mmCIF file of C-alpha atoms in Angstrom:
data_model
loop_
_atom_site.group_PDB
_atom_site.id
_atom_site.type_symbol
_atom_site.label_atom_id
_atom_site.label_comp_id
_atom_site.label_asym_id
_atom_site.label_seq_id
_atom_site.Cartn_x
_atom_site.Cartn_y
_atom_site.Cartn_z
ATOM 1 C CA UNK Q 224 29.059 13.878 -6.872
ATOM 2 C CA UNK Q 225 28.594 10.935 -4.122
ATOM 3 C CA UNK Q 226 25.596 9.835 -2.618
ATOM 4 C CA UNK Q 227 24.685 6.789 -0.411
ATOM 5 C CA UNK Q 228 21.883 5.323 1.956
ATOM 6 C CA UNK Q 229 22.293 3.824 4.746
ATOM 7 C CA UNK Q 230 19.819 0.972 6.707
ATOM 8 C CA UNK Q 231 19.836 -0.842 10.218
ATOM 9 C CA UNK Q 232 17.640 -3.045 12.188
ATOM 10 C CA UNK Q 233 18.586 -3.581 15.991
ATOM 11 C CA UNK Q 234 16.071 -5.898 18.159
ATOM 12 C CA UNK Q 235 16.803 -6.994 21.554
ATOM 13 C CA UNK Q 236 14.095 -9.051 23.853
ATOM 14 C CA UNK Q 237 15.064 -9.430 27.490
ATOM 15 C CA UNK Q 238 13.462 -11.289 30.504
ATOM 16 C CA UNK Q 239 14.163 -10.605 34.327
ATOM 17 C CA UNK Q 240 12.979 -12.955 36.976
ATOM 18 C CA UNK Q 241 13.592 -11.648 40.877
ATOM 19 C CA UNK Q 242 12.252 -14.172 43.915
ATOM 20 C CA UNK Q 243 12.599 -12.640 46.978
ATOM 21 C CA UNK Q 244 12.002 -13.808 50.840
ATOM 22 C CA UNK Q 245 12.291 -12.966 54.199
ATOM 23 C CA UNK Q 246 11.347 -14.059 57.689
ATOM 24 C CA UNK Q 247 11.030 -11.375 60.641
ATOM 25 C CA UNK Q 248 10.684 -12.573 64.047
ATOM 26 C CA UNK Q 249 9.819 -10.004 66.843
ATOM 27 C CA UNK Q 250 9.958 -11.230 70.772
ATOM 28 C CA UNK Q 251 8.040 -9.892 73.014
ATOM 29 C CA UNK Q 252 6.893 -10.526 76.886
ATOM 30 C CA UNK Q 253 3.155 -9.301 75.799
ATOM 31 C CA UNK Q 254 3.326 -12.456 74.090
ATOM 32 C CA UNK Q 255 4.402 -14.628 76.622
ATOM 33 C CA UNK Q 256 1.740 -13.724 79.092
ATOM 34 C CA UNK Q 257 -0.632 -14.807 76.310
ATOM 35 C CA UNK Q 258 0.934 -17.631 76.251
ATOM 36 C CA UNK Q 259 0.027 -19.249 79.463
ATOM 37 C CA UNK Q 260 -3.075 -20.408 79.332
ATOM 38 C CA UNK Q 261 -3.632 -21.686 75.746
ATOM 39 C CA UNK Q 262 -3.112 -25.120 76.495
ATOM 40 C CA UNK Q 263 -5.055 -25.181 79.807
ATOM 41 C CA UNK Q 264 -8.652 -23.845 77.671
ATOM 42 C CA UNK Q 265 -8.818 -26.769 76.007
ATOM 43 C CA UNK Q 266 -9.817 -28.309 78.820
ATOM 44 C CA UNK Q 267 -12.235 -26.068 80.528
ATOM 45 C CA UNK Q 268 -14.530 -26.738 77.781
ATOM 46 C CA UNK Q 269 -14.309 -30.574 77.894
ATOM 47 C CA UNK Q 270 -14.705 -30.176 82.034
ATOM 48 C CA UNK Q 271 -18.008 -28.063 81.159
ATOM 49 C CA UNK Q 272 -20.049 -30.151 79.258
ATOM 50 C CA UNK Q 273 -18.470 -33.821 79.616
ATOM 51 C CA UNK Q 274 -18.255 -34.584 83.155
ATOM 52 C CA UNK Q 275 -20.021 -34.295 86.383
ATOM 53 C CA UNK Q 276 -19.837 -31.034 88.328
ATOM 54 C CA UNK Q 277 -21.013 -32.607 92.064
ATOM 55 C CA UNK Q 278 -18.579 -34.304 94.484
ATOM 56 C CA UNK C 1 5.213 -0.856 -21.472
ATOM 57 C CA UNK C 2 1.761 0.937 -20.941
ATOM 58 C CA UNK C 3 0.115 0.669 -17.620
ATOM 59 C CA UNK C 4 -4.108 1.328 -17.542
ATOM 60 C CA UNK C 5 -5.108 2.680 -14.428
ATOM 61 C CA UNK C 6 -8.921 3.415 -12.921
ATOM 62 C CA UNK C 7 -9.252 6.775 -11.196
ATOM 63 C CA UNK C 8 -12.181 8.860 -9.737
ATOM 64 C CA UNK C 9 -12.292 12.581 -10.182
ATOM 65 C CA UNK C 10 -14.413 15.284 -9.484
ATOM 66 C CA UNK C 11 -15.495 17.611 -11.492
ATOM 67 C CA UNK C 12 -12.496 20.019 -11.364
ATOM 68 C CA UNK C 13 -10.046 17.263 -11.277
ATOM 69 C CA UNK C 14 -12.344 15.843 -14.355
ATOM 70 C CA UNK C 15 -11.611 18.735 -16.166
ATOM 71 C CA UNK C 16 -8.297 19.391 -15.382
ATOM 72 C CA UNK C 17 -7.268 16.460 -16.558
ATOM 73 C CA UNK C 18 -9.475 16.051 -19.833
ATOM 74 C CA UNK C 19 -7.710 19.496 -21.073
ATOM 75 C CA UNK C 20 -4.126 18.205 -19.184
ATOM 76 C CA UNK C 21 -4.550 15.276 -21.297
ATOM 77 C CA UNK C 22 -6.507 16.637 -24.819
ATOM 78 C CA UNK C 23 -9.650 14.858 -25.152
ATOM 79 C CA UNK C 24 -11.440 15.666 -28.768
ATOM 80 C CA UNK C 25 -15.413 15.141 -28.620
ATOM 81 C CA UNK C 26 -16.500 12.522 -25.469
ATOM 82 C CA UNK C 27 -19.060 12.844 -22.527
ATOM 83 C CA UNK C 28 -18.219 11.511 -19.063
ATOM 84 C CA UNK C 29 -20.643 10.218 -16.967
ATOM 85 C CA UNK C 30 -20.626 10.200 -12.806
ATOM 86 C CA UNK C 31 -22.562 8.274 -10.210
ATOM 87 C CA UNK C 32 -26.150 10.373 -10.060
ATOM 88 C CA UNK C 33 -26.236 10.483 -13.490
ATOM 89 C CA UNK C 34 -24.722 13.846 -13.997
ATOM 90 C CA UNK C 35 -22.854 13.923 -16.995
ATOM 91 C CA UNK C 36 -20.461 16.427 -18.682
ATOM 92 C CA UNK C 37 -19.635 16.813 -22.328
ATOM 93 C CA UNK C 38 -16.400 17.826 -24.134
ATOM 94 C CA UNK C 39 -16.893 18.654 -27.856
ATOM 95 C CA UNK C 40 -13.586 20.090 -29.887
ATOM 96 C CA UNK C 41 -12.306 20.409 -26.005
ATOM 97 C CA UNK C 42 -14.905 22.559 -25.208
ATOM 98 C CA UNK C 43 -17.127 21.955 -22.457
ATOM 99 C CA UNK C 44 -20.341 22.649 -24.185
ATOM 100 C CA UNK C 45 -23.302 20.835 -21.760
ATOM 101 C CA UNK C 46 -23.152 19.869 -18.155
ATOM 102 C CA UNK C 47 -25.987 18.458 -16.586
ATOM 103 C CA UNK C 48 -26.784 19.189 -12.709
ATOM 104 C CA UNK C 49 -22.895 18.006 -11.560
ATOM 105 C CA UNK C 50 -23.528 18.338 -7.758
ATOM 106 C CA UNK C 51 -20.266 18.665 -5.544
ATOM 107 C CA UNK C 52 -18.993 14.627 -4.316
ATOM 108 C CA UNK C 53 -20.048 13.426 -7.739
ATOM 109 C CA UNK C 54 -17.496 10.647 -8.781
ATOM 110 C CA UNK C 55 -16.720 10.523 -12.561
ATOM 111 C CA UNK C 56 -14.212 7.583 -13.383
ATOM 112 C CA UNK C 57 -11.919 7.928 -16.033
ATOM 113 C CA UNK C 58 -9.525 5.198 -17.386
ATOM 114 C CA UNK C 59 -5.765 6.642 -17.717
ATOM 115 C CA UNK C 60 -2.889 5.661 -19.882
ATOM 116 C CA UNK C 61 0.744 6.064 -18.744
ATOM 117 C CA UNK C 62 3.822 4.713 -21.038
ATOM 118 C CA UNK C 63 6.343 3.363 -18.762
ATOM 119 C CA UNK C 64 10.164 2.918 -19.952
ATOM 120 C CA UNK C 65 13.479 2.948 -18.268
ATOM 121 C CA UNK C 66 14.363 5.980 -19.829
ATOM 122 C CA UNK C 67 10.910 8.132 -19.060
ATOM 123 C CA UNK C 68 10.377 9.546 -15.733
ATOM 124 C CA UNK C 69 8.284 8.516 -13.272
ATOM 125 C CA UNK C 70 5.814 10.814 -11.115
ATOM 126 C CA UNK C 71 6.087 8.521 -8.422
ATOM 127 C CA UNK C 72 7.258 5.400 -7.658
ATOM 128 C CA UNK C 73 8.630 2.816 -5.072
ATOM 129 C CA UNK C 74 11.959 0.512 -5.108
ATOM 130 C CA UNK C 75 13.070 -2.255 -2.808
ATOM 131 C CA UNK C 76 16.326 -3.360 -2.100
ATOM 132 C CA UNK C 77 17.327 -7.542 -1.553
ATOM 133 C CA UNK C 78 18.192 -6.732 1.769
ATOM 134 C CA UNK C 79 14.284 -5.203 2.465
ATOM 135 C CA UNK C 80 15.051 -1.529 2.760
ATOM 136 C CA UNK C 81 11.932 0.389 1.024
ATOM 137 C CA UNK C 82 12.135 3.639 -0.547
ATOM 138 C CA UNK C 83 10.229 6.303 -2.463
ATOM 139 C CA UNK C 84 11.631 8.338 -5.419
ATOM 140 C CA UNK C 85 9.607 11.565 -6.893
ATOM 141 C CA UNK C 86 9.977 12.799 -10.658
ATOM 142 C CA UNK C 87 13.569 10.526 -11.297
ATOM 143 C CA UNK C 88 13.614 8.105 -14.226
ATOM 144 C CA UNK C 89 14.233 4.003 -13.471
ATOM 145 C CA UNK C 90 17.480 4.285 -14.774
ATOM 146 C CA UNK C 91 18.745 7.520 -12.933
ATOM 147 C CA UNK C 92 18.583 5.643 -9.679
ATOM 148 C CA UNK C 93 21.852 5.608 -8.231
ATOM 149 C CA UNK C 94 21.875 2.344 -6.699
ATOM 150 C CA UNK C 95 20.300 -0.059 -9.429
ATOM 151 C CA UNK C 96 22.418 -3.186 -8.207
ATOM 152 C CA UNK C 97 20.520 -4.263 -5.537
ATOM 153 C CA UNK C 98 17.623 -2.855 -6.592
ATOM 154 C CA UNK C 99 15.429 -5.933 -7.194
ATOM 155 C CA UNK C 100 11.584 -4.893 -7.152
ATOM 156 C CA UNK C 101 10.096 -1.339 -8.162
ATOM 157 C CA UNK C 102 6.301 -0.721 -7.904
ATOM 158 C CA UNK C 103 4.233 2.552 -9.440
ATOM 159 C CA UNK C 104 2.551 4.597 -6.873
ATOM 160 C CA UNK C 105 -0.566 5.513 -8.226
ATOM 161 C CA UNK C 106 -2.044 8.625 -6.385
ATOM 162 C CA UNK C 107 -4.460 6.259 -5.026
ATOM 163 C CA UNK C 108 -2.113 4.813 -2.708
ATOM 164 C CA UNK C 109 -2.391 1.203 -5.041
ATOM 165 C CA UNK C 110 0.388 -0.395 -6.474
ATOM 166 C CA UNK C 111 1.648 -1.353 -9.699
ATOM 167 C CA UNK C 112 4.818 -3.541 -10.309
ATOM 168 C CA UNK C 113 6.712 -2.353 -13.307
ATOM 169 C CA UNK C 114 10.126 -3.649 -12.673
ATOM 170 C CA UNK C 115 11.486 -6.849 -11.094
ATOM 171 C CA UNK C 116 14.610 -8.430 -10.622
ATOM 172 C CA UNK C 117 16.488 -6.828 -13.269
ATOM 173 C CA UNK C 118 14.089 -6.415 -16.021
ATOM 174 C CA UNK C 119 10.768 -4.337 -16.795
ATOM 175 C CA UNK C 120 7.731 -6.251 -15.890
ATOM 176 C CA UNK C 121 7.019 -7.404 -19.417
ATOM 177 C CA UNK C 122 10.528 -8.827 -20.161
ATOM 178 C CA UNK C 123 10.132 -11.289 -17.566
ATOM 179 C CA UNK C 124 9.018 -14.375 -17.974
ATOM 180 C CA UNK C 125 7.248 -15.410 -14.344
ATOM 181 C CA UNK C 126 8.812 -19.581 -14.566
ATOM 182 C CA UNK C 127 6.148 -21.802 -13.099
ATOM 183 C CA UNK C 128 6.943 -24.937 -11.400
ATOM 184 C CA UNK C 129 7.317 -28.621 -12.652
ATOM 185 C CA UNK C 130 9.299 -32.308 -11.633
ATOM 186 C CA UNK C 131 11.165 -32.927 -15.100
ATOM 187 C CA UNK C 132 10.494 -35.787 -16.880
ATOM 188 C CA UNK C 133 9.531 -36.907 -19.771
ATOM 189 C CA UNK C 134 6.029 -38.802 -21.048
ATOM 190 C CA UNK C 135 5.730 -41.645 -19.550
ATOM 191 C CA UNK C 136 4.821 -44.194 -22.316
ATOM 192 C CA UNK C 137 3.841 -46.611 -20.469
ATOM 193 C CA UNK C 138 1.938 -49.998 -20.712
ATOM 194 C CA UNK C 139 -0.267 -50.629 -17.095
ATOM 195 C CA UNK C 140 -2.456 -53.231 -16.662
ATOM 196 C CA UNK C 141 -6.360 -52.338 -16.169
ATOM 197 C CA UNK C 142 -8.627 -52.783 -13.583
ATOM 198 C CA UNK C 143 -12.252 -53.700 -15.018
#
């Protein structure tokens, strides 16, 4: 006659740690020809109010 | 070894056990005040016993190594818990490591009969204490 027990205790933690980046650039003419004239408005507001408008 | 334990029974469980366990001439009372009375273990007068009605009755079991045990609960050094039905103390298998058995008492409570080695009235439960002896002592007073 045999008998027997048996007993087990198995306890895992874990941690995960995932940083992830990117950078897409897409060229296109459309915005080229927007390009133009950003620089230039600056200055059609400071020509409207702040200086004279007659010769 | 005898072990008193508190119960509450209905009134079929009541009498059940009061002709399990041969009761002479006694009345048992309940919460509402209904009471029944045993007399030569008859049940001669009962007095409006409504259904839910709690009688408590105080229970004597003899516990030895040798006697079996309805139910009870053993655990190991290691912390492995287990549950043995109708088996005596000694007829466990594995008494080596055995170090603490309890009594489960049908009221899911607990009752420690047996502990490292020895029924619960062999041992001795050693408190704590530095040794030393008196101190006999002369120190000067403050007054």
């Amino acid at each position: 006659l045999r008998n027997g027990e048996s007993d087990t205790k198995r306890n895992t933690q874990s941690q995960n740690e995932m940083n992830r980046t990117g950078l897409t650039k897409q060229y296109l003419i459309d915005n080229l020809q927007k390009l133009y004239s950003m620089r230039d408005t600056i200055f059609k507001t400071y020509d409207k109010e702040c200086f004279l408008h007659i010769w | 070894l005898i072990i008193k334990h508190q119960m509450k029974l209905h009134l079929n469980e009541l009498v059940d056990w009061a002709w399990r366990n041969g009761v002479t001439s006694e009345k048992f009372h309940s919460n509402n005040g209904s009471y029944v009375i045993f007399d030569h273990s008859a049940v001669v007068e009962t007095y409006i016993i409504n259904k839910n009605d709690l009688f408590n009755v105080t229970e004597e079991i003899e516990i030895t190594l040798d006697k079996p045990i309805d139910y009870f609960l053993e655990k190991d050094m290691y912390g492995n818990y287990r549950e043995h039905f109708g088996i005596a103390i000694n007829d466990l298998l594995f008494l080596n490591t055995t170090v603490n058995i309890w009594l489960v008492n049908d009221d899911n409570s607990h009752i420690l009969i047996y502990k490292d080695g020895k029924l619960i009235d062999e041992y001795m439960y050693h408190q704590f204490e530095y040794e030393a002896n008196q101190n006999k002592h002369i120190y000067p007073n403050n007054k």
